[PDB]
Amino acid sequence: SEGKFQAFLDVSHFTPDEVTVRTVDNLLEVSARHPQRLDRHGFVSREFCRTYVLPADVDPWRVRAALSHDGILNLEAPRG
Amino acid sequence: XXXXXXXXXXXXXXXXXXXXXXXXXXXXXXXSELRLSEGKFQAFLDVSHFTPDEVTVRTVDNLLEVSARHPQRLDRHGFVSREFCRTYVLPADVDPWRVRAALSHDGILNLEAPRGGRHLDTVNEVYISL
Amino acid sequence: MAKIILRHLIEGKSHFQILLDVVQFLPEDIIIQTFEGWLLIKAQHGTRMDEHGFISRSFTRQYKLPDGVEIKDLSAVLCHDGILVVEVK
């Protein structure tokens, strides 16, 4: 855990195509916004924007972003 | 195609039945695919696999049911049997009766029905009991 | 400041092969059963939402064996891309 501050967010609800992040200043954002999914019970629309407060020790640059086939998007940033 | 949908084209061998959908949007008031505009409710389907006698269309209330089902034939790979019962949801404005349908030589049913039969109203909002 | 981007994610003789095009027919719906020798499969997609209009299907196809073939050496596979192949390896 020490050295690199990583945040784990389950993006399983959303598609890998409709995925947005964007750094902007010290804070690190994450935007999704789906269209109406087919589903089993009926049509469903979902939109979520979670802003992760990155520390002053961690850079804006070299911020790695990867999502597993299970739907676990890990936003990591080395400090220093 | 790959996990991130990065494709690398391939055919070579034979294939089976079915098709892929056409251009359509959501969040409307009404609900190859539909092309229903303001006044004329039209549709289209790839019924190329089926013979004209095999195709049966009926408007059970407000739903234009397009039934198919064709027994085993020669095709190319072997004895193949198909079946499909695609139903369309017409708005309250469109008449359940007075629905036209045309099968092309290519094998495409081009359904049509005009809007103007009912007033078509409603919103209503319920309260939580807790 | 600048936006960050996400990443991740990765015949002739002695053999008989039959690759078919399983569209939106799920593996829970598709069933590949082999009798005496003829390779059979049925799609059968239930009455789903299907975006525009609610649709349903059924695609049962039987493929004849080339005489010298045993319904045990054949091992089928439904690839993620959509193409389901029944071949002997």
Numbering used by the authors:
A (entry chain D): 70 to 149
B (entry chain A): 20 to 50, 65 to 155, 157 to 164
C (entry chain Q): 1 to 10, 66 to 144
Lines quoted from the article behind this entry:
sHsps are found in all forms of life and typically are dynamic oligomers that have ATP-independent roles in cellular protein homeostasis, protecting the proteome from uncontrolled aggregation especially during environmental stress. The sequences of sHsps from all kingdoms of life contain a conserved, well-structured “α-crystallin domain” (ACD), flanked by a variable, and generally longer N-terminal region and a shorter more conserved C-terminal region. Here we have investigated HspB2 and HspB3, which co-assemble into a tetramer with a 3:1 ratio of constituent subunits.
The resulting monodisperse hetero-tetramer was crystallized and solved at a resolution of 3.9 Å, allowing the roles of both the N- and C-terminal regions to be discerned. The hetero-tetramer can be described as a dimer of two AP dimers, AQ heterodimer and CD homodimer. Reciprocal exchange of the C-terminal VYI motifs into partner β4/β8 pockets of HspB2 chains A and C forms the hetero-tetramer which is bisected by an approximate dyad, that does not intersect the AP dimer dyads. The symmetry is unusual, reflecting the unique stoichiometry of 3:1 for the HspB2:HspB3 chains. Whereas chains A and C form the β2-strand of their respective ACDs, chains D and Q do not, leaving their β3-strand unmasked along the sides of the groove, while increasing the space in the shared grooves. The map has been interpreted as having 3-KIILR7 from HspB3 (chain Q) filling the pockets of chain D. A 3:1 ratio would then be the minimal size for a stable oligomer.
